[PDB]
Short mmCIF file of C-alpha atoms in Angstrom, two decimals:
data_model
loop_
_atom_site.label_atom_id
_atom_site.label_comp_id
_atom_site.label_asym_id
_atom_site.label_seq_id
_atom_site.Cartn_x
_atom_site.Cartn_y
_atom_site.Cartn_z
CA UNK A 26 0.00 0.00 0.00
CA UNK A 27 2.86 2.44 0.36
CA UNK A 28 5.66 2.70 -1.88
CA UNK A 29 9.38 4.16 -1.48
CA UNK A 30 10.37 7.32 -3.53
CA UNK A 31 12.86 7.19 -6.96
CA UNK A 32 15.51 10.45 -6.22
CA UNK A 33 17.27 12.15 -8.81
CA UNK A 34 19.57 15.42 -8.61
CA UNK A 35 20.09 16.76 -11.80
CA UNK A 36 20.94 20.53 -13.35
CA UNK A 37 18.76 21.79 -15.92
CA UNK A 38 21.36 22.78 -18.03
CA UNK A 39 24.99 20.91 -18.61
CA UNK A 40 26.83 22.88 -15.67
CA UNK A 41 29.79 25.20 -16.46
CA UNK A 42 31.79 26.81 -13.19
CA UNK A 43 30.37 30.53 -14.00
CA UNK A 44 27.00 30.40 -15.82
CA UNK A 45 23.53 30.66 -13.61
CA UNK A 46 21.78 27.51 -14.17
CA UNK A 47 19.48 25.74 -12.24
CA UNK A 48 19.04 22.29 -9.74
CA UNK A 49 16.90 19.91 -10.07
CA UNK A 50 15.42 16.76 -7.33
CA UNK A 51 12.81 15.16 -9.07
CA UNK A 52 11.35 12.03 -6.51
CA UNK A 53 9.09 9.92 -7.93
CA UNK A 54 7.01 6.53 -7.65
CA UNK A 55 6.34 7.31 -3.87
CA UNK A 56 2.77 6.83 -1.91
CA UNK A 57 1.33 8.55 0.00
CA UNK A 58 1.69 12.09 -1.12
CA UNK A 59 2.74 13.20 2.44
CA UNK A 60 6.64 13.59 1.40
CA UNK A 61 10.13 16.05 2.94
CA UNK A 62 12.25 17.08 0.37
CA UNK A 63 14.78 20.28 0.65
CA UNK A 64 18.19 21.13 -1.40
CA UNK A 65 21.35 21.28 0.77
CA UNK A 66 24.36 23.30 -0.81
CA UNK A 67 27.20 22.73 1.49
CA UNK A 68 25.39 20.22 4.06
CA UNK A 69 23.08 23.40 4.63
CA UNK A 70 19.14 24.14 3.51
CA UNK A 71 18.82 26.21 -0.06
CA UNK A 72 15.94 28.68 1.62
CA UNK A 73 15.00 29.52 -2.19
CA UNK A 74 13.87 26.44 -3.58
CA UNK A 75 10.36 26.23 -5.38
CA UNK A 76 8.11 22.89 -6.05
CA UNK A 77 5.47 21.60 -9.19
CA UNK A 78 2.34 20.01 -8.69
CA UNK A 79 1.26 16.58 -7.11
CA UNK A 80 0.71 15.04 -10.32
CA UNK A 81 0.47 10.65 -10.32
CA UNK A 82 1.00 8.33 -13.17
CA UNK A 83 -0.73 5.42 -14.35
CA UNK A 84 -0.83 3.17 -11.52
CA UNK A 85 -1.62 6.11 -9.08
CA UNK A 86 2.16 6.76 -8.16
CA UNK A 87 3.32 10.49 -7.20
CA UNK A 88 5.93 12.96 -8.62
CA UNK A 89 7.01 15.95 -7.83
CA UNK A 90 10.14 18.83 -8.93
CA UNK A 91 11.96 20.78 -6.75
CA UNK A 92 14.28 23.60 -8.33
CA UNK A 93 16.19 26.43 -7.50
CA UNK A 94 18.78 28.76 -9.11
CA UNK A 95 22.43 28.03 -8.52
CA UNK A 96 25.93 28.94 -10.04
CA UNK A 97 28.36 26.48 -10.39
CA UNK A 98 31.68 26.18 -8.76
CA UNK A 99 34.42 23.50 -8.06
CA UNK A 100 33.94 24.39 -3.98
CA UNK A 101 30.35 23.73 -3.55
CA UNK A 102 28.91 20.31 -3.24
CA UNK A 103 25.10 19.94 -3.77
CA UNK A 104 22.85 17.44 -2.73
CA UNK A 105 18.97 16.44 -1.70
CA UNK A 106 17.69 15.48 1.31
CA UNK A 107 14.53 13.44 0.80
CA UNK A 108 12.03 11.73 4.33
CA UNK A 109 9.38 9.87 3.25
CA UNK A 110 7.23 7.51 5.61
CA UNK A 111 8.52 3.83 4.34
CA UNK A 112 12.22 5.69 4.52
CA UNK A 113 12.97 4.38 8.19
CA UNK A 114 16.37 7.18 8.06
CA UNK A 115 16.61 9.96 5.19
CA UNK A 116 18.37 9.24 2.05
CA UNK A 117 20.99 11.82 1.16
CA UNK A 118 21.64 12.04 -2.35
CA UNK A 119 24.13 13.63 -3.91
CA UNK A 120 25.12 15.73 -7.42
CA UNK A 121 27.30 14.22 -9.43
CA UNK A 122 28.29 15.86 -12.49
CA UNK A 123 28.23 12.37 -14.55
CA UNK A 124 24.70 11.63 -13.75
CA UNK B 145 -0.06 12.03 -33.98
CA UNK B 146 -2.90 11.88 -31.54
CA UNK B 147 -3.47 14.35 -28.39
CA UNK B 148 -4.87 14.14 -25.06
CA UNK B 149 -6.18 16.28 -22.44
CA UNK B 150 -5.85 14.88 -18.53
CA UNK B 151 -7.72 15.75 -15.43
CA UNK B 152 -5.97 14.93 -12.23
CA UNK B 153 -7.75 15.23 -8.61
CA UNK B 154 -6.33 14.39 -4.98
CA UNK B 155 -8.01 14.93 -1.67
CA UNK B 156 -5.83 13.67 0.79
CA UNK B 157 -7.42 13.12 4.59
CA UNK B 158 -5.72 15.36 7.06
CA UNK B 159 -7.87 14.76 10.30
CA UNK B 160 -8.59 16.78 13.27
CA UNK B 161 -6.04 19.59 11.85
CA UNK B 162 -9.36 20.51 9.44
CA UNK B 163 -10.29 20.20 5.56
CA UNK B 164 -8.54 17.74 3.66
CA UNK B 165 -6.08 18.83 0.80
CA UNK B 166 -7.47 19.38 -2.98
CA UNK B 167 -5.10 19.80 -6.01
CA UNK B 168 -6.74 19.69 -9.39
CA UNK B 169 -4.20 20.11 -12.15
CA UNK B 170 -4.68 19.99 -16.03
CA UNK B 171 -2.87 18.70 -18.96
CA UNK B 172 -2.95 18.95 -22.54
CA UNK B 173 -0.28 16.68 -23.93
CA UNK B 174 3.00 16.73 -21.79
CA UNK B 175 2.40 20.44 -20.83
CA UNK B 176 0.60 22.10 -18.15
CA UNK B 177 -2.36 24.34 -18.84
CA UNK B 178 -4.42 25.46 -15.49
CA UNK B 179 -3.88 25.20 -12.19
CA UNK B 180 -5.96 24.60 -8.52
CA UNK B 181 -4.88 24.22 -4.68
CA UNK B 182 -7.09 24.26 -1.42
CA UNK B 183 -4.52 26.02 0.15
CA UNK B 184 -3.65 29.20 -1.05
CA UNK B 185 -5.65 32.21 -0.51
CA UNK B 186 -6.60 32.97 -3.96
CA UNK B 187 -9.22 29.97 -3.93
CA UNK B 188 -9.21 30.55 -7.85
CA UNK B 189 -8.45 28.56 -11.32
CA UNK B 190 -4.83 29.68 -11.76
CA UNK B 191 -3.52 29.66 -14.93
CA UNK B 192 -0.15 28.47 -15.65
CA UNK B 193 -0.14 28.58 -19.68
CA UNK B 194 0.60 31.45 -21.21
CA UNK B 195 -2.28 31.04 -23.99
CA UNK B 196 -5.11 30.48 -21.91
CA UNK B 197 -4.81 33.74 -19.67
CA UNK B 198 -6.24 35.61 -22.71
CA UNK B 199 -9.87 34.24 -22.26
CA UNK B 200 -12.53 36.43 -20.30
CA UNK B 201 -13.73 36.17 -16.04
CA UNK B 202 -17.12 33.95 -17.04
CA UNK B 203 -14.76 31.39 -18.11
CA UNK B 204 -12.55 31.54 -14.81
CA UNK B 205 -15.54 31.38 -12.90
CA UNK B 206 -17.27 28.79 -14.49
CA UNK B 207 -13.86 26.15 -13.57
CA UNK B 208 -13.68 27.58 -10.47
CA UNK B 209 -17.65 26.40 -9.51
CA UNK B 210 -16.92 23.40 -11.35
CA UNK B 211 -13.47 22.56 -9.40
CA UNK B 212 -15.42 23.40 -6.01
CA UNK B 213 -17.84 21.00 -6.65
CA UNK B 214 -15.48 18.60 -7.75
CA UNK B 215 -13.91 19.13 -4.29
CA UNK B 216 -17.05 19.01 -2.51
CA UNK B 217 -18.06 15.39 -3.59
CA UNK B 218 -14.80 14.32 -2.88
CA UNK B 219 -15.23 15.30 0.93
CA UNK B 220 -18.31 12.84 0.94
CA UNK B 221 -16.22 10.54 -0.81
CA UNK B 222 -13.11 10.41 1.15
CA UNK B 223 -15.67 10.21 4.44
CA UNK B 224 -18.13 7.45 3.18
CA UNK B 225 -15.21 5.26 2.41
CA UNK B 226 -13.61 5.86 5.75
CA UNK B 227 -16.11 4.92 7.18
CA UNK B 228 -17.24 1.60 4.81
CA UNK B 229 -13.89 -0.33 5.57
CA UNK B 230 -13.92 -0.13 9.54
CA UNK B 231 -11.04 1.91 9.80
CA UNK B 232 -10.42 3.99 12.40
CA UNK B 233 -10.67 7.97 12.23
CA UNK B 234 -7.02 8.75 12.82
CA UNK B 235 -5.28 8.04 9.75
CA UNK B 236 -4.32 10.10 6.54
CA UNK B 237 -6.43 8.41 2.85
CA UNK B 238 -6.24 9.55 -0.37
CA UNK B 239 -8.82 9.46 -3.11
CA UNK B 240 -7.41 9.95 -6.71
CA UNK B 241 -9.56 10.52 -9.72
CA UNK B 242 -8.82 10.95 -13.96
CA UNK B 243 -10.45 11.33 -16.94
CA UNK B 244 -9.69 12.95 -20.39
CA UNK B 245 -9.97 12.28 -24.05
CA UNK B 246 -7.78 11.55 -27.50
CA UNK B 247 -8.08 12.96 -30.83
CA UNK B 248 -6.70 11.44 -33.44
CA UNK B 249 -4.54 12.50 -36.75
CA UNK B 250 -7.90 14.35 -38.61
CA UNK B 251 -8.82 15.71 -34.75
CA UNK B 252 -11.53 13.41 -34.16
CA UNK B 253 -12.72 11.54 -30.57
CA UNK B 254 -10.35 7.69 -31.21
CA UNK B 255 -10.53 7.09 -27.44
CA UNK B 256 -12.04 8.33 -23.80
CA UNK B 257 -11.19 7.20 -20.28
CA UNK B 258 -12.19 8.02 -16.76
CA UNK B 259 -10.50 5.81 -13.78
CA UNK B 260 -10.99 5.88 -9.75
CA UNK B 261 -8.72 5.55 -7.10
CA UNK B 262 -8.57 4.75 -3.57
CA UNK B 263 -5.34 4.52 -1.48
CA UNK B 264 -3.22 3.74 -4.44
CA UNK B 265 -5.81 0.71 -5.34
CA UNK B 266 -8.20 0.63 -8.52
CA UNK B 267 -11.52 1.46 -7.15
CA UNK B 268 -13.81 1.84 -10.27
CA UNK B 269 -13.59 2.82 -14.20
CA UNK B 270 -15.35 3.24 -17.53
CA UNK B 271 -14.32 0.28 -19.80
CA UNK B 272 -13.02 0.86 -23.44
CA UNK B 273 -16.36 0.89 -24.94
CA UNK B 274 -17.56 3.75 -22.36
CA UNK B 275 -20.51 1.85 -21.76
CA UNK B 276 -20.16 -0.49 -18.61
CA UNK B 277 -17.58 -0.34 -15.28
CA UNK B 278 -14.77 -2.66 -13.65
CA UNK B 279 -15.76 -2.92 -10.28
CA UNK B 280 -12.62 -5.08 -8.83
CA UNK B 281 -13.76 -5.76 -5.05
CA UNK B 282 -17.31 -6.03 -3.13
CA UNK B 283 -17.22 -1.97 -2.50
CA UNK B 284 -16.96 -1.57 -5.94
CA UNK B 285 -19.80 -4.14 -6.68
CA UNK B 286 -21.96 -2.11 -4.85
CA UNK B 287 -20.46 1.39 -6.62
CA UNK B 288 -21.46 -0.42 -9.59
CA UNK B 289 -25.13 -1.34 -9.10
CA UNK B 290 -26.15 2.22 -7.80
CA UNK B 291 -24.07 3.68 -10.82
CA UNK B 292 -26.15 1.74 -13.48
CA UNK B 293 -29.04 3.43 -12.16
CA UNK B 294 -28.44 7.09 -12.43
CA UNK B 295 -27.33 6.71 -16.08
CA UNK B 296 -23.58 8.16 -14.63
CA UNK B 297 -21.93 6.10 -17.38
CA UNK B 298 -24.01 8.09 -20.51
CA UNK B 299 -23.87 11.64 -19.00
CA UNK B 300 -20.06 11.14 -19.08
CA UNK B 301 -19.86 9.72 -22.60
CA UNK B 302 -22.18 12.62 -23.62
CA UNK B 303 -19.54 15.10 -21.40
CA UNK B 304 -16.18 13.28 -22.79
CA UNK B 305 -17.35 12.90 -26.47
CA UNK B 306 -18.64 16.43 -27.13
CA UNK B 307 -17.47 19.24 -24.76
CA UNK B 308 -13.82 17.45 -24.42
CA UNK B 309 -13.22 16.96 -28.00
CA UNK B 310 -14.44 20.75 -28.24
CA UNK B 311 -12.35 22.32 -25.86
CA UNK B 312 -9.43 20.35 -26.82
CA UNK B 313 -9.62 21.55 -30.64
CA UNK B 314 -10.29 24.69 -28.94
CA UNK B 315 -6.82 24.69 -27.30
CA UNK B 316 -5.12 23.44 -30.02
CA UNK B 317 -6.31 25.61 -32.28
CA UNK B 318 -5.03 28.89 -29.57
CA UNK B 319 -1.70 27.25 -28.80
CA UNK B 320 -0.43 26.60 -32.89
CA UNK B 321 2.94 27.88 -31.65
CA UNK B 322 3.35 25.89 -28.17
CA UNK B 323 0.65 22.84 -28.23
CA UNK B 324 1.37 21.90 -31.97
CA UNK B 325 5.28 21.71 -31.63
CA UNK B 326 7.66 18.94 -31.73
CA UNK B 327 11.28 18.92 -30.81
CA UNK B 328 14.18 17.36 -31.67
CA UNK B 329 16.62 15.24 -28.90
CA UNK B 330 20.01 16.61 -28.80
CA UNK B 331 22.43 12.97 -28.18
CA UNK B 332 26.12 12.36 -27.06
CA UNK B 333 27.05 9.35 -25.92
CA UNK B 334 29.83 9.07 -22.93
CA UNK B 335 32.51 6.65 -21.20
CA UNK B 336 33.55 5.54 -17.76
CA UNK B 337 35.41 2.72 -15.62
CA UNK B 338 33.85 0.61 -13.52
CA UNK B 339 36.88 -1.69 -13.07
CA UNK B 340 40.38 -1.88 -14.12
CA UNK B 341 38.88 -4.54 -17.58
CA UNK B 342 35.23 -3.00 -18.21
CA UNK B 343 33.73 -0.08 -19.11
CA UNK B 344 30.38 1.55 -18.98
CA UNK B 345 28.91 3.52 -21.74
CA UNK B 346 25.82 5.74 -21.54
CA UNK B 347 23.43 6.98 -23.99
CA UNK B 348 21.87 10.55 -23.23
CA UNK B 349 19.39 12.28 -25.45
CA UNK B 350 18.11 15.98 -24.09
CA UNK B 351 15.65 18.68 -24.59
CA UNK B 352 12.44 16.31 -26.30
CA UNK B 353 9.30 17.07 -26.76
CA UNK B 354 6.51 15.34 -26.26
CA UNK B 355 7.75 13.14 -23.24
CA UNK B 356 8.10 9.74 -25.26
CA UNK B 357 11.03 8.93 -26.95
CA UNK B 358 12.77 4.64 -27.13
CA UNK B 359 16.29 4.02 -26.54
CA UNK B 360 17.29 0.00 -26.77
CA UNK B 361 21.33 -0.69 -26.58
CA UNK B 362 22.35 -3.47 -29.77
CA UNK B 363 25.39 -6.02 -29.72
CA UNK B 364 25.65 -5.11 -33.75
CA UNK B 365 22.28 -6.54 -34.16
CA UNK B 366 20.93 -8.10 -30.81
CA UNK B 367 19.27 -6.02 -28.38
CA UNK B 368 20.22 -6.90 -24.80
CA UNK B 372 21.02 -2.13 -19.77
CA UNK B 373 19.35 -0.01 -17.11
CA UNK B 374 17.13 2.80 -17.79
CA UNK B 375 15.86 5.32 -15.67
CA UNK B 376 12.71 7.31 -16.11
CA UNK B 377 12.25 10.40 -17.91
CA UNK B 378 12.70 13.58 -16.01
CA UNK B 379 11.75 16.69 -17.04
CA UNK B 380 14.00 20.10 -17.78
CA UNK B 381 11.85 22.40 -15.74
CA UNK B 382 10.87 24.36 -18.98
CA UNK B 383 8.89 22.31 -20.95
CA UNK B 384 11.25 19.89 -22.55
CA UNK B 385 12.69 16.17 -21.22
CA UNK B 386 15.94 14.51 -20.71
CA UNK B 387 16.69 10.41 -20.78
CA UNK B 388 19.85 8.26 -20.76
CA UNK B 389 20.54 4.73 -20.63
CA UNK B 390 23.49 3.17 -19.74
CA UNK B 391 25.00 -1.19 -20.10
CA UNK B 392 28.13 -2.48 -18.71
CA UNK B 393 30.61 -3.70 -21.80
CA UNK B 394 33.35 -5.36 -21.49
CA UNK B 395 36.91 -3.47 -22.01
CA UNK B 396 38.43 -3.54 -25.68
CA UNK B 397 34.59 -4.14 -27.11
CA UNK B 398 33.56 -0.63 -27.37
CA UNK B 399 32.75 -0.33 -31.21
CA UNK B 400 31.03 -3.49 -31.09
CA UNK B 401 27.84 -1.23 -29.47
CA UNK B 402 25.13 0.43 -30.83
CA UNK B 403 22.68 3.15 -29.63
CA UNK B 404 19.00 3.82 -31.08
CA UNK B 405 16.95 6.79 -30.67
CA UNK B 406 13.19 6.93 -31.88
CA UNK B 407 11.22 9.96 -31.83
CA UNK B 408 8.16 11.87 -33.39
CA UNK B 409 10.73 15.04 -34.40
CA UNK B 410 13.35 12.70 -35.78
CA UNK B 411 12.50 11.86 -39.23
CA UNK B 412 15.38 8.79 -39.28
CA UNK B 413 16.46 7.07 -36.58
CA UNK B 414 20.02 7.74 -34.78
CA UNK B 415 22.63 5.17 -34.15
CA UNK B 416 25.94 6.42 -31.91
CA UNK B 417 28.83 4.74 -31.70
CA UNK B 418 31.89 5.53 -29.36
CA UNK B 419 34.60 7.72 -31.15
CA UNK B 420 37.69 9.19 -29.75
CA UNK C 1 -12.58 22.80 -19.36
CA UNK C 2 -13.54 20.51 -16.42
CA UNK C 3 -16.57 17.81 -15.97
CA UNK C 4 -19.34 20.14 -16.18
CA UNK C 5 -21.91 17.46 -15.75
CA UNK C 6 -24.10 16.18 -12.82
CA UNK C 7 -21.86 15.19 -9.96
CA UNK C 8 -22.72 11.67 -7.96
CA UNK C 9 -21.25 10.08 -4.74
CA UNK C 10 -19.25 6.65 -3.91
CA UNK C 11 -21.29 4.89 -1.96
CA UNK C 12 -21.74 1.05 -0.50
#
């Protein structure tokens, strides 16, 4: 009856160090709706970060986007917090440039 | 090709803090064309399209009664089913609800749908024909006897057949620059190391539009690879990879394939230097 | 343009 989230961290854009672009955490396949995500720069909260609409796919599954604006430099590591219900302790995932 | 035009409705339970939740987006396609939420203070039918905020206020309100009562039945329905499976009145359920319609190539009704939901389980739906429903458990049963009653099933095939394919050739016809476009993936293919013999390539194709779009990994001729599910850009377009793990030396012995509506040929990549 | 028909309720 409930079902654990699918996390991705992405960038909008392919990231160069100096050009604004933007970050992406799109979690889907989860149930129920009632779902934590927030964008860490650094190990600390992005307080700008701005969400979509609870949408659900074909077999009545959630998704969601979170985004913000960002700049990208060799110094600052990005990542995505995520707390769901069926996640017994939150699942940090991080930005890799390759993914 | 065809084109579609999706309703989706959630009301999930939030008890003793007050009303339950209600978010009633709209799609046309793969893009976004009005907006609802029980939480904000506007109360209204947003707009998030930038072709449909040029219609007049009797149109705005007309959604926005509509949406309210659409919210309003879904109170009764979120509390009779609470109550109908002996739960207790603590918990948090969700009630889910779609329906839309497809047009085909000359922009004429090929196929209409309209589902139920009910913690993530099918509840109740309109078969193909639009004529009878699926009831799947004994709640449903019952759903379905008072349902064939009421003539519910021939109101909405009256609703979906007429005023959908309508509107939608309505919208279409508006958004000739946005609705009516198709994009082409941009693809470059990549290289890792997983080991010290082996080697992972990856097949990435960017900025697509609509959403669907195939990619299948060939040994020169055999199809076998992970994929992961389409995300989207945050603007309107989508992104997609998929990725196999070859064996080291091997590398120009594997082929990529891309299908999609904007590409009139399809694309093969192979790994170059 | 949303349902604009009648509007009935689950029951059982």
């Amino acid at each position: 009856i409930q079902r654990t989230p699918k996390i991705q961290v992405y960038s909008r854009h392919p990231a160069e160090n100096g050009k604004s672009n933007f970050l992406n955490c799109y979690v889907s396949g989860f149930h129920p709706s009632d779902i934590e995500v927030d964008l860490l720069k650094n190990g600390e909260r992005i307080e700008k970060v701005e969400h979509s609409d609870l949408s659900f796919s074909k077999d009545w599954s959630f998704y969601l986007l979170y985004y913000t604006e960002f700049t990208p430099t060799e110094k600052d590591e990005y990542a995505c917090r995520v707390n769901h219900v069926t996640l017994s302790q939150p699942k940090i995932v991080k930005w890799d440039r390759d993914m």
